[PDB]
A paper describes a structure:
In this paper, we report the 2.5 Å resolution X-ray crystallographic structure of the catalytic domain of S. pneumoniae NanA and its complex with the inhibitor 2-deoxy-2,3-dehydro-N-acetyl neuraminic acid (Neu5Ac2en). Data were collected at 100 K to 2.5 Å resolution from a crystal grown in the presence of the inhibitor 2-deoxy-2,3-dehydro-N-acetyl neuraminic acid. The crystal belongs to space group P212121, with unit-cell parameters a = 49.2, b = 95.6, c = 226.6 Å. The two monomers in the asymmetric unit are related by a noncrystallographic twofold axis, superimpose with an r.m.s.d. of 0.39 Å over 470 Cα atoms and bury ∼1200 Å2 of surface at their dimer interface. The active site contains the usual catalytic residues common to all sialidases: three arginines (Arg347, Arg663, Arg721) that interact with the carboxylate group of sialic acid, a nucleophilic tyrosine (Tyr752) that is proposed to form a covalent intermediate and its associated glutamic acid (Glu647), an aspartic acid (Asp372) that acts as an acid/base and a hydrophobic pocket that accommodates the acetamidomethyl group of sialic acid. In common with other bacterial sialidases, the hydroxyl group at C4 on Neu5Ac2en interacts with an arginine (Arg366) and an aspartic acid (Asp417). The O8 and O9 hydroxyls of the ligand’s glycerol group interact with Tyr590 and Gln602, respectively. The topology of the surface of CNanA around the location of the aglycon is flat and open, in line with the promiscuity shown by NanA towards α(2,3), α(2,6) and α(2,8) linkages (unpublished data) and in contrast to leech sialidase and Trypanosoma cruzi trans-sialidase, which show specificity for α(2,3)-linked sialic acids. Two inhibitors of the influenza virus neuramini­dase, zanamivir and oseltamivir, are currently licensed as treatments for influenza and both were developed based on the framework of Neu5Ac2en. The study reported here lays the groundwork for the potential elaboration of the core of Neu5Ac2en, particularly around the acetamido and glycerol moieties, in order to develop specific inhibitors of the pneumococcal sialidases.
Numbering used by the authors:
A (entry chain A), B (entry chain B): 322 to 791
Write the structure that this text describes.
Amino acid sequence: ALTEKTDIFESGRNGKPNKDGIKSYRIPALLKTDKGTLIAGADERRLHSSDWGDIGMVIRRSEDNGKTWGDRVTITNLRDNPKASDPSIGSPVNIDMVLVQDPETKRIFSIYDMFPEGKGIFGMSSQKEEAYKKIDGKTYQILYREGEKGAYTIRENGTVYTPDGKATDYRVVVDPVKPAYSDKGDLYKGNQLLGNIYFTTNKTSPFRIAKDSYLWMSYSDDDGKTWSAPQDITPMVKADWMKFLGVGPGTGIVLRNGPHKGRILIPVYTTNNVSHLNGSQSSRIIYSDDHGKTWHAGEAVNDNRQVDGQKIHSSTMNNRRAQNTESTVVQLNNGDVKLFMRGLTGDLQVATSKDGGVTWEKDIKRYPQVKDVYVQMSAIHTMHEGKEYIILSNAGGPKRENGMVHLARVEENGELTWLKHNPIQKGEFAYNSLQELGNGEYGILYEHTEKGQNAYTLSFRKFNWDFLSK
Amino acid sequence: ALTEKTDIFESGRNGKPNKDGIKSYRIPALLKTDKGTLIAGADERRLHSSDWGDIGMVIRRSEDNGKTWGDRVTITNLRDNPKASDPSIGSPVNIDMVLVQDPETKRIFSIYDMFPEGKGIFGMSSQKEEAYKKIDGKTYQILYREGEKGAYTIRENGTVYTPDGKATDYRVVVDPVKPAYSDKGDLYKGNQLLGNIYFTTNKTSPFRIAKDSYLWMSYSDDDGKTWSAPQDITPMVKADWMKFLGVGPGTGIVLRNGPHKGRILIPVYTTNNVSHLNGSQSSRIIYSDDHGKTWHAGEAVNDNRQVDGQKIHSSTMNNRRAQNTESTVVQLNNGDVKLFMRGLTGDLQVATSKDGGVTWEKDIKRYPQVKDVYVQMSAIHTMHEGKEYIILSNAGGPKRENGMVHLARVEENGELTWLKHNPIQKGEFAYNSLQELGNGEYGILYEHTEKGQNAYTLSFRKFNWDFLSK
Ligand SMILES: CC(=O)N[C@H]1[C@H]([C@H](O)[C@H](O)CO)OC(C(=O)O)=C[C@@H]1O
Ligand SMILES: CC(=O)N[C@H]1[C@H]([C@H](O)[C@H](O)CO)OC(C(=O)O)=C[C@@H]1O
Ligand SMILES: [Cl-]
């Protein structure tokens, strides 16, 4: 059996905003917390549906295990540029979240992309501006002044600082904010405002950050009810050559066994300056061994990998077919990590790691039993009456439609046997996130539209083992 | 006055190897030391005059102000691949050197390029191979093993470690090297010599280093009679995005003024993976503030540089004309650093640093009164009775011909106004290196051909100044 859909994030209708003024909801993430709570995350795309604009990172909570859901809690929404001529592209952007709970600390992390005002990924500059500087062993974000060339950093209490190293006070950027963090990056000269460092057009202040892709994180210590101010984790994980670095949205994992047990894995992907979105999309994970304090980049699956007798690297590649993008991560009972990667083979592409996410084996396994129409997927480990299984959910196709939940037995070394492919949602079907619910039940937050819904409405369903196996 | 042609590094004739079977000599570097000694350095290009093959770093000394010269002392020459099916491209390569002396320590530095077997610069791999890896960092050089993906590292005493971090113990590379350092890189299984980590063709050992460009350093404390084993400085200065990193050959300086007195400046240039040789050649310096122990990279002249309306970076640029390659550096008495860069404008190109070679000013000064036929140049600071004077020497044109010596008056602001341009050599003329001999006398080692000489024969000329004035 399978429950009827419960709509958790309701988008507007026929191009028009909903009751709150919001046209679109988008990128689902679902988390089952130690307290038994269900946390549902999404992009709140106010006016409109594209991969940019006024977008907030929002969650909702359920305590009755998915029956009823509380209020929308906004984690982060950066304030729009009020003097931008095109308001649909006139806001700093947060986009795509990953959720994970550290089982030791009970801390819940939401990691998500950040772009200043622009078209977030489809609006990146073709030239690099340095985003960060290491002054005397400490890393500070850079600022670029109008007309002037040179450093400018952000130190101490948001006190700016000239390329001279002179504490040119008057100037402060806010980073211990305050309201719902919409005032992050606000620039003051005195007690009076001015502008915001994430503003790109028609600026009322002289300072902006570098035009780049960024990676932010916020945490909750009260089961998802209140969230910390965004931590900029970018410099810990982003290399000099990297153009884009963003999350593979959905739900991350904590390793439960082997010598790296307790390691947090967050799926991510990069583009390089050689081919950007045309032929360099490359999956990897970032990880933390200290309960979310510091983060590190693992190697890309495409690093030192052989395609057609020629080795590639994610920093230099230009090959459309060899890309792998958004991914979903799972650990086996034998300690292996499997990375299910969105790609362009029409097939399920899977990478294998032996050292817990850092390095990847030579070959990408392909399963013709599971279609991939170039859309996000979620997969989870689950134990049923002995051993062992993985549950994977994505569009059946052709196109982003006919939602499928696929069931595989985990064999031996460490092989997968696809046992059944059960339809879960007819009509439009895109992004989705699976969770184990306890007691042989499972949950899913997925993208789907009906009856003129804008794109997308995010909906929840429970199901049991019978729905999966017969 | 001007002294007649005095050859130091004699090339061959009409495609014949000279007395010692060395067809070609190339890339002059001239240094006068603390004891008054002159050092002349060259590419010992044994097999041809191309930018690859079997090349040794060699010097010849003079105690008598360049009257007569001592014999050849090989700094470094890596042994050839005896199994390579083409000897002309069948050797690990060293190429281009900078000479410089620390005034306080008297240590003389030779900084030069290195490539494994191949066409060094004209034969670089299309895709990135990681060359180094931090482990409890601790940075080690990577080895790749035929048939396998995965690190392999060179650790203590040259012991090869497996990608897992297990000692192969058996496998070891020669790091403290002995002979002419010709055994550097040799790979052993115990006392069994198998091959060399710098060979890339028809290999006899299982391991090779990354196909990349490297930057090596040797030093002598005995005024140039013996030299240490090559030190690999690459990982201190070469960023991840960099394809090529190599020196602007000739002679370096030490800062004598300002808040950075004692800093050693080595001119270098980089390429990127977007356009490599076709549009990315970018001049910068590397420097040492601790007497040549540790090195750091300065920012490129092309970093955040407004050109043709747009801002570029050395890591992302594709602009042929905006390139700046080999360069020579001088400090002014007001503390400014000037960088004369080989370019493709036909003009002389000059950039200014006000923080001792790290950052560069918005603007590149073009001096039409001075020609540049896209070839290396040489410049030195020199006081004579007044203020302030710089000598710049290069080709006259059209083509690599007519050795010119130009003089400029260093104004206080501090621009420079050119006074006279005097021919020092007729015929075909290319690379050169200038020094200050004292008593208002100057010396120049340069590149020249006559009587069917293989190119080049590298000749010396001593003289002032009435040549410059009158
Ligand atoms: C940060 C961002 O833009 N993420 C978006 C992603 C990305 O643009 C694409 O993977 C580029 O190749 O595309 C999609 C999509 O519905 O297909 C949704 C994400 O919101
Ligand atoms: C590292 C190296 O090869 N240096 C060479 C240099 C280089 O190829 C060029 O600067 C690329 O544009 O070319 C020349 C030259 O004929 O002028 C001489 C140098 O030996
Ligand atoms: Cl602003």
